[PDB]
Symmetry: D2
Subunit: 384 residues, 4 copies
């Protein structure tokens, strides 16, 4: 509809079953598949979809990978509903889930006139993940009840990586913070800058803020030798100048913000520009934004410096929107450059970072990208 820029989770219930699987669907509730949505805690509002045409097996009863993967890349975790005991299919999915770094759990349909219980098997057969959950169409107690629990435990969780690891408190440790011209609005500072300061202090250090011109001064006078400097833009150069200490580990704001929404992959994938060939396609996922009629970074600068920095014949595809894009649109793209400011919730960035990995498409973002296209090297500061 529209909102203030909900990150709703996605879940896949897989299986060859249906009359002993769909009962699980519609029930256990608070161009072919069924995407029904509801809500559960302790986690939130969510969506449950079922193996669409993934129901058609092979003569050997095998999954149909390529067809699956293509479905399973969105998932935040999956659910397996089996009718019988383990078969090849049951293993095939689990191998993907596993394959695709994606959490999941298994279910059943406990009929009570025989007195069975197979899950002992899956307790260890197809992995463990202690994925073991008795159930039934006889919507019994363990239905849309105790499931949400563990499953919650299943999902991601608390990444929350320190805005810094090399803080160094105690007898202090200065942290220069050199900003631009202003930043707007009146009597305000951009979040990154504020977030920083708050950190230096949470790490009982001392934060010093200072404009460009005054770098000369400050640095020289101040007896205290810093332990961390931080900037943004080509402003990093003039600083590289009166460095004034290379012993000193410096960095961008842009980059520290980047560090909070998986950094590795971005460096890994950004370096990957050098092997770009004429005619290849790059995806500039610019999300929802107010675009300047001036040199828009995402649709102008970047594309440009990109050709320049490499060999032309490059094909760009800008994509706007709150949600990630449909695979159809990005499949067969060498690199994806995603805006940073767009997403702010680290957890919702991972969703997208993972998705990209699962499709094996290297993704990076404006920050890293531009830093790279200049010298994204000095911000070592994380090598662990």
């Amino acid at each position: 509809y529209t909102m203030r820029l909900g990150f709703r989770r996605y879940i896949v219930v897989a299986g060859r079953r249906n009359v002993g699987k769909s009962s699980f669907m519609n029930a256990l509730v608070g161009t072919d598949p069924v995407y029904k949505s509801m809500e559960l805690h302790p986690i939130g509002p969510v969506t449950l979809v079922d193996t669409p045409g993934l129901d058609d097996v092979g003569e050997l009863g095998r999954l149909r990978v390529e067809k699956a993967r293509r479905v399973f890349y969105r998932a935040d975790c999956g659910i397996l509903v089996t009718d019988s005991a383990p078969t090849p299919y049951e293993d095939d999915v689990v191998n993907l889930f596993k394959e695709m770094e994606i959490p999941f759990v298994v279910v059943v349909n406990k009929i009570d006139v025989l007195g069975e219980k197979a899950e002992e098997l899956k307790g260890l057969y197809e992995s463990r993940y202690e994925a073991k959950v008795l159930l039934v169409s006889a919507l019994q107690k363990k239905g849309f009840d105790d499931i949400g629990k563990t499953i919650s435990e299943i999902l991601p969780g608390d990444e929350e990586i320190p805005y810094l690891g090399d803080l160094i408190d105690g007898g202090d440790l200065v942290i220069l913070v050199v900003p631009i011209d202003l930043g707007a609005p009146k009597g305000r500072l951009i979040m990154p800058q504020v977030h920083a300061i708050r950190e230096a202090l949470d790490r009982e250090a001392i934060a010093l803020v200072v404009k460009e011109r005054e770098l000369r001064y400050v640095m020289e006078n101040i007896g205290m030798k810093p332990k961390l400097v931080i900037t943004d833009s080509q402003v990093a150069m003039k600083v590289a100048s009166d460095v004034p200490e290379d012993v000193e580990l410096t960095t961008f704001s842009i980059v520290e913000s980047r560090y909070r929404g998986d950094l590795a992959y971005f460096v890994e994938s950004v370096r990957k520009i050098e092997e770009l060939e004429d005619g290849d396609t790059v995806v500039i996922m610019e999300g929802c934004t107010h675009r300047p009629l001036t040199e828009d970074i995402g649709r102008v600068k970047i594309p440009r410096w990109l050709v320049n920095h490499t060999g032309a014949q490059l094909n760009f595809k800008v994509i706007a929107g709150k949600d990630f894009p449909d695979l159809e649109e990005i499949e067969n793209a060498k690199l994806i450059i995603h805006c940073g400011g767009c997403i702010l919730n680290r957890s919702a960035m991972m969703r997208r970072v993972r998705m990209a990995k699962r499709l094996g498409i290297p993704m990076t973002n404006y920050g890293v990208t531009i830093s790279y296209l200049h010298g994204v090297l000095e911000r070592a500061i994380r090598p662990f």
Copy 2:
């Protein structure tokens, strides 16, 4: 950056001048053109751009229309800065502005060592629009001062068309309002429905709300014969059934909301589906939205019913984003289908409706479109 979905106005300062025109730029302030932005009242924050490469004249000193139009279609109004007296160029632009239903005003550069004043000319020569404004680089009083005034008066204004014209108050006049299943959220009603009711009452009438099933009942019993019924979706059919009076002028909610953001053009342009040819391209401007993984109206239903209703070989181009799209992307498109819910400010819809007209591309929207693809006829109710 990001916001809660600012509608900033756009203005073009045109002229062959520059050293006697750009002084007007940067000054008079509170891949080549200069887009500088500021703010002025009584209207708001705005942008001033200058004739980029439109500076290069012909050997006869003519404008260069096609090149201009391509620029001038965004404008909310234009500003003309002339160095000399009227020439062909001065007329050429004015003919466009005029041509393109776009407001504007004229300026100068009053040097005071001669004692001139030409504007008397333009008082009537190139149109009137009483566009007459002395000025100078000697940034004198009448600079970024008394301009904003009139100019404000120049721009659009108060469309604010009655949510209804056939109200009919006095001895009352019922207005059935037949809704769907629910609408969410708890104890709430969608705005349209509320907006309606408030109107019936502002027009001292009586609003009756009632679900589907109960149409049979209500209609029959109620002595009172209505004067207006209102629905949404295929629900309009079941109503067409126990109409129960065709004398009775009925309509969609979707449609009344449409009526508030220029209706004509939409009907005019929507009817235009019949002359669509194989291979032609349609633009589904879906703005910023949360897309269902189910049949998304804009990217699925509509496209589909569209092929169906006509001859295939159709090419679609969905476009998302807060802003209208760049001409490059839509130029050479037979029709544009724009989401309704997206924009809510009638004044900001007109901006876009005009833009489309100026490019001569027929535009319509989901509402009208779907109504049409069913029977958008009965809602006569406006023929004036």
Copy 3:
């Protein structure tokens, strides 16, 4: 500090202990008592206070009621930390809690070198409330862990009483809704009115909205005989006129809103005006509001009609503020008239309704009050 008008819960940990009770305090964490606050789920942010001077026992080891009650009236539930086995004190509190309709739970300090477990006792001795919770300063697993759980279960919960019980859906059932002049703002309706409509519809009925003047008309014509009418203000009179059916159960909006934040007590307490004596004091708790410099209902009208309706010599005490007032300020007040619009969360109104009961001070509110001072009788509609 300030906010948009957090309803934080209050809890009392009681006991004669302290070195075997306070360890429970500060620890088990995520002009004399200690009010430390933290947060716990599944419920929210909360406060834990301890028996201040309630630590001083009698020579017989009795509680000190009057002194307690005075403390215990705020509580949303209480916590009992005992050192020894049941004694008189342990019973005394429980009798209050019980006495004062307030939930609670019991704790301990399990030393493991003997091998005890007394709670079996309190399992049934001092009530049940299955209040049984092993613990220790050896902050063991069952500390600030499994407590929040049950305790949550302890607290209030889901009152959520139907905006109506006599709905009557099926073959429909009209519900007139007669409003005032307007209500503001443009194209909007006050919540109550919207909430109503949504209900009629959730109860598959038919809602008819209609202004005053048009009552004559509608009623007569309309074949359908209503089942519920609803108004506000002296407007109820003109309706009482062309009633037009007394068989017909009518009511105020003001009153239905009242029904959602305990109605009984309000009627019970409002009737209590007749036994008011000269010199008695009434509390007009007007919460945080924008006061008209015109006849403010709370500080003018009500007080006035109040004297009028009874014998003067009345003493008023208006009290503003987000929170309920300190007992010191209201103790020894015959009646409390609380604004309705102020609180909106039924659950936070109960907090206050209970508090008043616990102090045995009759409380009512503007709605009921004014309805009464006119004829709050006809809205029978709830007698169960």
Copy 4:
């Protein structure tokens, strides 16, 4: 009703007239007086009230000051509507307005069958304020039209005093900022602190933030000798310690925030504690707040340190609420202590500061007060 904590302006139309004055009322529109409200620009929504019982003159035709003042203290400016030429009454009011530092304008009722125009008189007679405005009940052009203009010009305006005057940019100038323990919330800083930093930078200086413990360090090492230090709470003491330079002008955050909502009066009035006598009454205007059940500054600490610091027998009167309090409630009060955090809009604080002056009641606030009760002396820094 309720809102997120509108500052609506107040205006008094004065005069002995009424049939030639009230026509001005109700008309010229977009326990006895009439308070009608509307809206006008360029300023906002506002209220117009008329001389209630101030209509009854003396046998000599004099105003009735004491009775007036009592009315005129709320006003943001006044309007004078005269029937005849200047008389004593016309002078009397103007003397108050003038007396009471309050803006105003004069009007008429131009009958056109004689051909008059007296305003020439009032052009200079009763002051000037170029208060000269022809009008009439014949609601002519100059009615609710050109009035709002000038009148707007009449009212307050742009105080906006620099968060600092001794900035000292150029070759820099450090500004230590020593904070508490934290401040909450995560990765955030209280506004004052941020506002400060932004200033140092807007004044091309250098802001250094640093906790307590680290004062020792920083100060000593850092070659740079500061030019401004800033703190809050008793934390100012430990700083007074390693001052470490008294040459150095230091201060509270609390105080700089105070500086932005008239400081003088607060110092002037706060010093006035020494002449407090037993039995006198102090007003603690605490506005709308979330009160801690712990030592609430406004209702506990302050009152307490207040008695202590002086002679008991003191009477306190705490007053909560969005609006200033009615004179009846505060008249005959020696001092008023107003919360700072409450109001944030300097312009709306002045409204209240003026009001207090007009009643000649000394007002101060928590900040100043507590600073004083310790040592509010060192923050000289403003002596101009």
